Design a protein around this ligand. Structure first.
Ligand SMILES: O=P(O)(O)OCCCc1c[nH]c2ccc(F)cc12
Ligand SMILES: O=P(O)(O)OCCCc1c[nH]c2ccc(F)cc12
Ligand code: NA
Ligand code: NA
Lengths: 258, 387, 387, 258
């Protein structure tokens, strides 16, 4: 519903959505909250949050480092849900999607994980290592708790995959810009035909021009993570320059979205 | 999929969507290959004329004196390469070519699977890059040189804990973008389907030879076949042909490290919790939070933080039993085999030996025909066992 | 004596008078054993079920591409122990017991014969003490640990140059006073009769398997069989069954070290003078004064300062040819086999390989069926070849 | 002939023969000559000289060290024959036997080696590593050059060996006191019956009482090497004490010989 409204206002006002991604707790709980508030303040249409996992097999170095940075801060899944509740409390309307790894949601029990998401006010959950063929238990728990089960549509997607992700997903469909893993250093048609949730393009998006291209291609917006996390990385010793730089990138990216 | 990716509730294909087409193509290649006579012939020929199959089945002469235990050792330590790992990499390499793949990706903990991949790669003309936990690379220079010597690119991983699990991740990451021309040569009977099935099928000649060899030498099936279990390839390779022979006990031995109660072990099957990682649903070493942990053991090759799905399943239905052996027990079985049989066993296989010695010593008047799978030779462990 | 102790003018029993009864008893035991079916069965069984015979005959696939040379490798590197040395120590150990001897004496240069003696000793319940040049002990810690690990007493010799030859002397000195209960397990096809004959007979299964294997795989005898020659055991083991097949060339390769003209080599057969030492009349490395010298080579196992009598004899009558291979040539053949066939050869065997590569490269249009005797695996040489 | 006369005078005067052994050139050429003159002066009935060989497989540590000491001095076979000629020049009647290793006599040609022995005035040659079964060429060359081919009679000698050594030897028969090798730290009947050259007992003789025992047993004398070489070894830094001590041991040994 939160995603629905976001896409209503967006398209209605002929605008593309810009969704930044960052790891919760990176580089520290307090700094993380500030970072997110700055993202939103700077023009973020939605948030894609990752919870520190020990073996992020779908992430490139940039993100891997973020997780390590997070772990270094003592951040845990329980602490992530706390930040999530606090974030939702300050921003009632912004859509919040979770980038998870299967074991973190399977740990305490699949249903229980989605119940906690619902309780905290999370809108969607994309489980990186759970393909459509192994998603049954995950989407059912999501639906049961009003959580949007996010699915990935890769470049090598055949028609069969296309129909499944269009029929199982909600909120938005994650359009993989390419193969490989997350790294800033790197279908829309059929999806629409099949009534798939608005597509958001991800992986390698770092150029404000890429956003216009995405929305131009027919995507409803774009997700950018490594690009954002790098800014955090470089200005790691100057919290102030971190937010300033963060603010400028997003505005440029968001700007290029309309 | 053409084959069932689950063993009871264990198994599956928990990998990013992008990699599913690759797995499906791999399963297709495997299924056809299995029915391809030219493929079987080629595989057999390599096993026999290049690897050294069939390996011998040695009856221990001194080790069991004074007890009613008859102990036999399946000599995979006599396989070209020094371990059982050679069997399956040969088959996976042929499969790669069958699929038209030109490069090979592999992960290795102790280095044995790395060396085996490099040698099969060099022989079959495939470019080969190996991922190794930056930590392991430094503790396994010998196997490293061997790998490079054979023309393989050994890439150390510093991400995470810089150990096996972190190497397994880099392999999948790499494969995620290269499944195109590269093939992922997984080292054990774990990971996403069809690897647990492919690896078992390419390691099953172990149990088939053993069955034929013991029937020949003793006129009856053993009472039990024992094997160490790091990830499960050597163990399942030995078990496979005996599963329908219900009279035959199957015993898997996980590393007990400093001891279970100590927390410093590598026995997830019996002391870990089911989780989802490395593309499979299976027991593993993880925190209460769901974070993945490392397996500990005096022997580097038994440090896979999880176990193969078919083992977790064989256990649940009670077909196989799993036990653990501590560092010291394995060390004692290592010294005992050297001094009394003139065979230096890998520290990994020592765990299997140690248990067989326990079954014998604990009930010396018990008449039993035991077969231990000597997965490898311990030349690699000479120094460590030296200190 | 029951058998002729000379090969043409080479051979004999040049040992202190006190040791002659021991040699005569050894020759007697051997002769009867050879006619003893229970002995043959026992030996065969150990070779097959414990050592790993028969070893494979691997056709090289990539190494010879672009030439008309077909190269096959007799895989003694796949023998339990890592080298051909295991074959004969098993037989000598059985002989010892046949004679009622309870202890075993052995000399070792690189350590391979030491390890082989220790393992056969441990298996057959014989006390075992090994003499090693104090110099060698220090450069072969790995093989040393292996030996001790297996329960053998390794005694380093500081007398003389503290190398192989000085170890051989201590063994005879020791045996001089202990022939009573101890047996001298000589490591090569040299020394006083009947060792050159006993060792050849206990290593002859190599050529017999090769002949049967190639006839099977190629339908014809090879054009030549090549083998490195340190003392001559592996070479004569391979040659024996082919001697009467005059169409088959026998080529022995002695270490050329830094090069013959350099003086720093280990090729006495072709560049040494006949002398009397180590109980035999044969070519050797000696000064113009008659003092015995050491053989030099990158590979420690080819440093016996002399050669076996039957080789000096086969050469003189023109049945076999002997050549030399330099350190660098052997090193290049070592790297080439690793990278193209995925087999790490012993630096010793590399000398044999190097020559086969030379025959091929020099006349690439020449159609030839060559068989190289891969006497051992090079795990032991990994570090040296590393530097 | 020289041995014949020695045994004539000896037995005639009811006396046992004492034969010291030392390595030529040990510890140096000049010191060696002095050492030998002292041996003779001190009462040596005959001399047993060894020429430095690289692989003395019949010698224990004491002698092995002597050879090493000799080699350290640059002593060679050619230099040994020089000392031999010089020694014979000062002592015309004392019998001189050579303790050789097969390769040293085989080197320049067997016959040539014995010709040189004859030329230098040597009386006998015992080749440590040449058993009776391999002695043909060696005794023939010896006979041809009037050199006494010395043979060893060990404890495990059967009747066959006994008849051969009695029939091939000359000068004296070397009676092995025991098995093993030379080391101070450690048949006569049949020999006489077969007309074997006077027997000299060797190996482990270091006690003046051992000499009386030997002659008492029926031996014509005893050879002692390690015992003598040790004295050289210990007093290696005091040439004077070396000769003094050397002199005293031999006199005691010789004394115990009658
Ligand atoms: O800008 P980039 O390329 O870092 O994209 C990040 C996209 C969000 C993202 C972070 N981690 C992931 C793991 C799997 C996945 F499917 C998506 C993501
Ligand atoms: O005192 P002892 O034990 O050192 O004996 C020395 C006897 C003379 C001697 C010296 N070297 C030898 C080598 C062989 C041999 F038959 C005799 C000798
Ligand atoms: Na494990
Ligand atoms: Na040699």
């Amino acid at each position: 519903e939160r995603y629905e409204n976001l896409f209503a206002q967006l398209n209605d006002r002929r605008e593309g959505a810009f969704v930044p991604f960052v790891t919760l707790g990176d580089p520290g709980i307090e700094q993380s909250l500030k970072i997110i508030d700055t993202l939103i303040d700077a023009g973020a249409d939605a948030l894609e949050l990752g919870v520190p996992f020990s073996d992020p097999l779908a992430d490139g170095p940039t993100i891997q480092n973020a997780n390590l940075r997070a772990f270094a801060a003592g951040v845990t899944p329980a602490q992530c849900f706390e930040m999530l509740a606090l974030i939702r409390e300050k921003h009632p309307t912004i859509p919040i999607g979770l980038l998870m790894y299967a074991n973190l949601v399977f740990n305490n029990g699949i249903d229980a994980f989605y119940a906690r998401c619902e309780q905290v006010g999370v809108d969607s959950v994309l489980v990186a290592d759970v393909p459509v063929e192994e998603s049954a238990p995950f989407r059912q728990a999501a639906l049961r708790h009003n959580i949007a089960p996010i699915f990935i549509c890769p470049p090598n997607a055949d028609d069969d995959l296309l129909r499944q992700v269009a029929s199982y997903g909600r909120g938005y469909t994650y359009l993989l810009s390419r193969s490989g893993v997350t790294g800033a250093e790197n279908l829309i048609e059929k999806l629409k035909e099949y009534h798939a949730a608005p597509a958001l393009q991800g992986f390698g998006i770092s150029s404000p021009e890429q956003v216009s291209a995405a929305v131009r291609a027919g995507a409803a917006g774009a997700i950018s993570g490594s690009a954002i996390v790098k800014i955090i990385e470089k200005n790691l010793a100057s919290p102030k320059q971190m937010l300033a730089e963060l603010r400028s990138f997003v505005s440029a990216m968001k700007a290029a979205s309309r | 999929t053409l084959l069932n990716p689950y063993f009871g509730e264990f198994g599956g294909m928990y990998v990013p969507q992008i990699l599913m087409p690759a797995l499906n193509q791999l399963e297709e290649a495997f299924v056809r290959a299995q029915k391809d006579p030219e493929f079987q012939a080629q595989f057999a020929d390599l096993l026999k004329n290049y690897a050294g199959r069939p390996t011998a089945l040695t009856k221990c002469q001194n080790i069991t004196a004074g007890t009613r235990t008859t102990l036999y050792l399946k000599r995979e330590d006599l396989l070209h390469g020094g371990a059982h790992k050679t069997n399956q990499v040969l088959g996976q390499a042929l499969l790669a070519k069958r699929m038209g793949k030109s490069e090979i990706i592999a992960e290795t903990g102790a280095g044995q699977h790395g060396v085996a991949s490099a040698l099969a790669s060099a022989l079959l003309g495939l470019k080969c890059r190996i991922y190794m936990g930056a930590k392991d690379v430094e503790r396994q220079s010998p196997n490293v040189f061997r790998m490079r010597l054979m023309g393989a690119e050994v890439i150390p991983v510093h991400s995470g804990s810089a150990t096996l699990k972190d190497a397994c991740n880099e392999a999948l990451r790499d494969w995620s973008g290269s499944y195109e021309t590269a093939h992922y040569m997984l080292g054990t009977a774990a990971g996403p389907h069809p690897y647990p099935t492919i690896v078992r099928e390419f390691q099953r000649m172990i149990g088939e030879e053993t069955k034929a060899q013991i029937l020949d030498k003793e006129g009856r099936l053993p009472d039990a076949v024992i094997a160490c279990v790091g990830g499960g390839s050597n163990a399942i390779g030995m078990f496979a042909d005996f599963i329908n022979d219900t009279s035959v006990g199957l015993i898997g031995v996980e590393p007990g490290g400093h001891g279970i109660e100590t927390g410093e072990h590598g026995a997830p099957l019996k002391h870990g919790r089911v989780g989802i990682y490395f593309g499979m649903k299976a027991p593993m070493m993880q925190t209460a939070d769901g974070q993945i942990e490392e397996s500990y053991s005096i022997s580097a090759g038994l440090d896979f933080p999880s176990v193969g799905p078919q083992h977790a399943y064989l256990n649940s239905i009670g077909r196989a039993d799993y036990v653990s052996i501590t560092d010291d027990e394995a060390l004692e079985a290592f010294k005992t085999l050297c001094r009394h049989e003139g065979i230096i066993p890998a520290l990994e296989s020592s765990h299997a030996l140690a248990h067989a010695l326990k079954m014998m010593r604990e009930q010396p008047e018990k008449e039993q025909l035991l077969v231990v799978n000597l997965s490898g030779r311990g030349d690699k462990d000479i120094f460590t066992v030296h200190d």
